[PDB]
Enzyme design. Sequence first.
Site, PDB file in Angstrom:
ATOM      1  N   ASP A   1      33.204  26.985  37.211  1.00 60.41           N
ATOM      2  CA  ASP A   1      33.495  28.079  38.120  1.00 60.41           C
ATOM      3  C   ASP A   1      34.262  27.556  39.335  1.00 60.41           C
ATOM      4  O   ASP A   1      33.863  26.569  39.964  1.00 60.41           O
ATOM      5  CB  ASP A   1      32.195  28.743  38.573  1.00 60.41           C
TER       6      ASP A   1
ATOM      7  N   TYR B   1      39.043  28.064  47.636  1.00 55.27           N
ATOM      8  CA  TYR B   1      38.483  26.750  47.943  1.00 55.27           C
ATOM      9  C   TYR B   1      39.595  25.725  48.142  1.00 55.27           C
ATOM     10  O   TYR B   1      39.457  24.791  48.925  1.00 55.27           O
ATOM     11  CB  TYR B   1      37.555  26.260  46.823  1.00 55.27           C
TER      12      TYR B   1
ATOM     13  N   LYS C   1      38.924  33.051  41.012  1.00 54.65           N
ATOM     14  CA  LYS C   1      38.823  34.251  41.818  1.00 54.65           C
ATOM     15  C   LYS C   1      40.076  34.446  42.653  1.00 54.65           C
ATOM     16  O   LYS C   1      40.670  33.479  43.129  1.00 54.65           O
ATOM     17  CB  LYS C   1      37.602  34.151  42.743  1.00 54.65           C
TER      18      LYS C   1
ATOM     19  N   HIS D   1      37.109  37.940  44.572  1.00 55.92           N
ATOM     20  CA  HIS D   1      36.247  37.105  45.410  1.00 55.92           C
ATOM     21  C   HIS D   1      35.357  37.913  46.368  1.00 55.92           C
ATOM     22  O   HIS D   1      34.136  37.718  46.413  1.00 55.92           O
ATOM     23  CB  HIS D   1      37.115  36.105  46.190  1.00 55.92           C
TER      24      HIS D   1
END
Length: 305
Positions: free
Chosen positions: A43, A48, A76, A109
Amino acid sequence: GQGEQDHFVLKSGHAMPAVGLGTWDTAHSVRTAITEAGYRHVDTAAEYGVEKEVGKGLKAAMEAGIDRKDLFVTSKIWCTNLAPERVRPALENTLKDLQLDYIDLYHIHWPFRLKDGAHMPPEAGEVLEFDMEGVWKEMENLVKDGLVKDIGVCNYTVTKLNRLLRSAKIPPAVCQMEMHPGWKNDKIFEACKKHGIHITAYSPLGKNLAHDPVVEKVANKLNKTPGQVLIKWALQRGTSVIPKSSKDERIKENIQVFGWEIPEEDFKVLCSIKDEKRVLTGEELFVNKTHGPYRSARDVWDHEN
């Protein structure tokens, strides 16, 4: 039911591994979690800023004999790209960084739009209007074009979920939420249940539950680590789980959660912990107690908490 299912079959029929490596030295970690720990579900998220590394980790594991079809990769789309015309370009950029020609699961997200270059907390004029319907339509097109096997959402509420369904041609296959003894979010879970939407729990350890004596006592009795108990708790709850860890040993341990279970009594214990340990309120990047549009955490969660 006894948290012994190693995967879940999505509404589309695709199988998704119950335990996935969260990515919240990423290349090494990913490569190792797959080739040594036995991971098959990774994931990640564009926000990020580690997809490039995840891609490198994924390439190495595949060049090492692991078939692409045997891997489950999730990503996401971030808030700044939650506009119809920015969905396609965002996913393609994701595919490039991950060096894949498709992903298995792609989530929204957060259900909020942000202006490019927004701050945390958000200043006035940074949290834009979200054309949820227009964006989802574009998400569905990703599925139709075969670039995404399944689309889903994270951090949703029943209100937003219901809105999403009143127009979705393709229901979200998965709903990813923060879940653990501290915050079970039964409500959204129940909403997902009725609609057949699978649920993935994130932040399994919490406000560190791994250090809560309650969990520790159960871990000592079962002779497992607090983290494994916490992860097994999610599984026995019927959700996939994505534990975040940076050490190969913890990562190896986190997936060693089959072949045993948590006695109903202990499981009852962990569940009966009052919901007051919610780590991600969303206040950090969506709350602006004065100008809004969300002047509190409750507004972020539609006052349905």
